[PDB]
Design a protein around this ligand. Structure first.
Ligand SMILES: O=c1cc(-c2ccc(O)cc2)oc2cc(O)cc(O)c12
Ligand SMILES: [Zn+2]
Lengths: 162, 47
């Protein structure tokens, strides 16, 4: 059901997505242990993910949340990095994409910092790094992450010692 | 997969120590996100 449409680097849509990626890189407290050492990315491709069924699933739930929260879906665009990105784009997010042992409970995690989601691309804590070189800081291998539309509704505020 | 705190739809993890870290968020239903853009990239070695 999913088709992927390549965006041209000349397209305003490509440029605003790339800007969000690059401008939200930060330094991490592990000194690059999990996701590598870097201040910026080489963006190779940005594809729009198009799936009618998954979109209608999303907007149906969004309306329910909005209606429970003074007509405010509290919708954000947020990053998600995962070894399962290929399953996600075809089948949608589900419990098999849950971070069972994460800080705030068994749920699906997203970040405002692209570099935070990058720590999860090769698995929890960077796993064993790229498949080819076993390198969490690989500068050669192509990585993928998702920039996702996320309905937060009424969000519980958890201050964390992070 | 856990539940949302009663009467909430998600959790906002707001870093209290590192003033430069941005927020992280958790949803408890897959239908609350749509994977809109797939981004293929390399990280770059600092110069
Ligand atoms: O982008 C994220 C992806 C994941 C993640 C965590 C565990 C999985 O099995 C798959 C993905 O965790 C995270 C945890 C965070 O605190 C922040 C994230 O952005 C993510
Ligand atoms: Zn590699």
């Amino acid at each position: 059901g999913t088709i992927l449409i390549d965006l041209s680097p000349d397209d305003k849509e490509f440029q605003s997505v790339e800007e969000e990626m690059q401008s939200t890189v930060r330094e991490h407290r592990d000194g690059g242990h999990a996701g590598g050492i870097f201040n910026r990315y080489n963006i190779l491709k940005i594809q729009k993910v198009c799936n009618k069924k998954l979109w209608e699933r999303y907007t149906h739930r969004r309306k329910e949340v909005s209606e429970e929260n003074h007509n405010h879906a509290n919708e954000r665009m947020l990053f998600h990095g995962s070894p399962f990105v290929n399953a996600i784009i075809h089948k949608g997010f589900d419990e098999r994409h849950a971070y069972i042992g994460g800080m705030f409970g068994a749920g699906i995690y997203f970040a405002e910092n692209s570099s935070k989601s990058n720590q999860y691309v090769y698995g929890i804590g960077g796993g064993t790094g790229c498949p080819v070189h076993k390198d969490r800081s690989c500068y050669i291998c192509h990585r993928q992450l998702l920039f996702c539309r996320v309905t937060l509704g009424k969000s519980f505020l958890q201050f964390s010692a992070m | 997969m856990a539940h949302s705190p009663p009467g909430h739809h998600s959790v906002t993890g707001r870093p209290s120590v590192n003033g430069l870290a941005l927020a992280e968020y958790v949803i408890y239903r897959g239908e609350q996100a749509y994977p809109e853009y797939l981004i293929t990239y390399q990280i770059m070695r600092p110069e």
